[PDB]
């Protein structure tokens, strides 16, 4: 009955905790002792992208690192040129409510989703040049939180209902559905090889999904409130979460626990975006109180603040090569830092 | 200007697009946006069907003005994550059925929803238009089913005028922000031609009391 199986669950989840304590022998802050500190990090703005007329919810850099895409609470979905402040495309959406966007690796498609429970895939390079809807994906109970392109013919999505899914663009039907969450999923991030990904729910937990098989492999606890932003250590063996606990964490995939926590007394506001720098020595973080920070990944100490914004920093992302960091707050502007 | 000939036309394209952006952002500020919230079997459809998945959207025009309502009750997910998208809506329209007060008990659910939304941080500024509909059956349930079922404490005698005003004072006494916002209640039966005129009559009070606040006159 239910009583016996629930009793068994306590034993299995007590076998795990006594199997995650025989591995820990030294924290990350003892290994990294007598290691030279990073030092003051001073960064000034280089651009200001002022096209939008209302709040901005998502952004994603092109692979070449010279083009940007940006979604706001307006019909428009703008494609920016980061070297010179120019617009290359303006797209009018079919629904004013947008909570995500994405830019394909090959550079031939964009994507967008919002509260209408539909994912739209736009096409960019066509004869009779204009931007037209190439495909409409339907079949989500709740609102789309985030999306990502595995390659030109596939895409993973995460929805308000406790589920993640994998889509094939040529034929509308899904191919694999991941259903292990309780609580709303908020964000996901793909591995560098695209053979695994990590998603963060609202029940203060995270998973580790195999794409090909369709089954979870590791479950990571530790937070107290919902999490909202995940990233991958460039190596591909660790990730870092950000929550409304006003606390980031840095888990790892081979020991299956938490190496360190970046939290400070002054901050009580929540975190909305997390990203590593190239070479995994700096972790950027966009706090709720119109500000941002830089944390020394190997040492809990904090690099200098990076605040130029006048409202919430909804989303930010480091460029693929590593030259610059772009943050877009609720006020229409996006400032690029360098 | 150290710009090749091809480079100049990319600036002329960007200044062609800034024209489209303003010329279409100046046509999206004329419309007045409203939000429609209600509980299950409260009678949202009647006022939706009165005047002309996702978030449903509706357009209606009265006496040279354009309104857009957003019926969002089909989301069926946590409201904390997506309700902060809705600031800048001119007014929230809430609607309560009076036929169901006895029926476990819906009214308390209504009260706790109107209380959660009324005191939220995002909606500190915006005003609420409270409909209280389906009063044609509420006239008949008063005699057969007494008002005491919701609250034994209430002293007053059971009259249509004496009960519905007391309920109204039960709803209007839930907002902490007396100074910041007001509530514009209105009784409506199943059929009332005048319903849209009360919304057009109250949004102008909201717009004037915000225009005399933007310049510090108040």
């Amino acid at each position: 009955e239910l009583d016996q199986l629930r009793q068994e669950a306590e034993q299995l989840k007590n076998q795990i905790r006594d199997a995650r304590k025989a591995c820990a022998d030294a924290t990350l802050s003892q290994i990294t002792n007598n290691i030279d500190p990073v030092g003051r990090i001073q960064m000034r703005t280089r651009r200001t992208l002022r096209g939008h007329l209302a709040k901005i919810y998502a952004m994603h850099w092109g692979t070449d690192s010279r083009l940007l895409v940006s979604a706001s609470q307006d019909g428009k979905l703008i494609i920016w040129d980061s070297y010179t402040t120019n617009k290359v495309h303006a797209i009018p959406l079919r629904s004013s409510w947008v909570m995500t966007c994405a830019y394909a690796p090959s550079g031939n498609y964009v994507a967008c989703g919002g509260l209408d429970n539909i994912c739209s895939i736009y096409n960019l390079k066509t004869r009779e040049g204009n931007v037209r809807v190439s495909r409409e994906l339907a079949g989500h109970t709740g609102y789309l939180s985030c999306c990502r392109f595995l390659d030109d013919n596939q895409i993973v999505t995460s929805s308000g209902d406790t589920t993640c899914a994998l889509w094939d663009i040529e034929t509308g039907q899904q191919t694999t559905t991941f259903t292990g969450h309780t609580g709303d999923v908020m964000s996901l991030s793909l591995a560098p090889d695209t053979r695994l990904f990590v998603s963060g729910a609202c029940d203060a937990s995270a998973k580790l999904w195999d794409v090909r098989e369709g089954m979870c492999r590791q479950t990571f606890t530790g937070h107290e409130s919902d999490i909202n932003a995940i990233c991958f250590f460039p190596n591909g063996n660790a990730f870092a979460t950000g929550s409304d606990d006003a606390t980031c964490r840095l888990f790892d995939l081979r020991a299956d626990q938490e190496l360190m926590t970046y939290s400070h007394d002054n901050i009580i506001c929540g975190i909305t975006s997390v990203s590593f720098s190239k070479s995994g020595r700096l972790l950027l973080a966009g706090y709720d109180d119109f500000n941002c920070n830089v944390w020394d990944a190997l040492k809990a100490d904090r690099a200098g603040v990076l605040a130029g914004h006048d409202n919430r920093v909804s989303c930010l992302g480091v460029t693929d090569d590593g030259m610059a960091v772009a943050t877009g707050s609720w006020d229409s502007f996006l400032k690029i830092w360098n | 200007c150290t710009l090749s000939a091809e480079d100049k036309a990319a600036v002329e394209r960007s200044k062609m697009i800034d024209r489209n952006l303003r010329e279409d952002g100046e046509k999206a500020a004329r419309e007045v946006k409203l939000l429609l919230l209600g509980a299950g079997e409260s009678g949202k459809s009647t006022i939706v069907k009165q005047m002309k998945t996702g978030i449903v959207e509706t357009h209606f025009t009265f006496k040279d003005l354009h309104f857009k309502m957003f019926d969002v009750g089909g989301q069926r997910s946590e409201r904390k994550k997506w309700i902060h998208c809705f600031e800048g809506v001119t007014a929230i329209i809430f609607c309560v059925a009076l036929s169901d007060y006895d029926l476990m008990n819906r009214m308390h659910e209504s009260m706790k929803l109107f209380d959660s939304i009324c005191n939220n941080k995002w909606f500190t500024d915006t005003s609420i238009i409270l409909f209280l509909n389906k009063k044609d059956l509420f006239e008949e349930k008063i005699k057969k089913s007494p008002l005491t079922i919701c609250y034994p404490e209430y002293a007053g005698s059971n009259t249509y005028e004496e009960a519905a005003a007391y309920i109204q004072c039960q709803f209007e006494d839930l907002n902490k922000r007396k100074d910041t916002k007001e509530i514009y209640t209105h009784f409506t039966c199943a059929t009332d031609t005048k319903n849209v005129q009360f919304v057009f009559d109250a949004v102008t009070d909201v717009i004037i009391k915000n225009n005399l606040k933007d310049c510090g006159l108040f």
Partner: single-chain antibody
Amino acid sequence: VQLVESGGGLVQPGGSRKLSCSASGFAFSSFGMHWVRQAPEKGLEWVAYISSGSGTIYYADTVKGRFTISRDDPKNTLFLQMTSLRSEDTAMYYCVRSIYYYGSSPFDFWGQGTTLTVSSSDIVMTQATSSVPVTPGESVSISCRSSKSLLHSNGNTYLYWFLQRPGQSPQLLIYRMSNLASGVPDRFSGSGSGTAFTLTISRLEAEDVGVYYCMQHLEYPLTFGAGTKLEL
């Protein structure tokens, strides 16, 4: 995505005929437009231009003040009106489309043109090989030279290549240095440096036997190079 043109015919000198070009199949309101003429046997030449929105109009030197170009966006038509035609204004008039943003391909599609018979400090491009014989399956290289450094400070060198098969309109092959126009076989490739250029065909079939042209697009007025005819 066809562009059809009309006008032409036989005109006595001094009488001004007009030319129309009726587009159908694309978004006409966001493309710049051109006109390119070809004399009876000579290489192409650049008559005029218009930007998007008719906000910027240029001209050539020999028609500056004699021709007037104008566009009609709602009716999808491009007009060129000629005035007091001279005996040396006899040429077929093609009509060329072009869009300018980051990463686009100008001169991607060309009209078929009309035939007009009037009765009776500039960058010099150079290619000086004509009627070069070729055999299918060989590797053929064709060279070009310019009179000024086409390499701009930003790293783009503005040099376009084209191909006119006998009896057809010309066709874009390489949009800039080290680039391949979409829709063309991968055989073609071109590598330059400074002001020396070349186009190389690794293994050619017998379908591409036609004249090749080369254009600088760096600054107006867009000169073209002489012809280079491949004979079989």
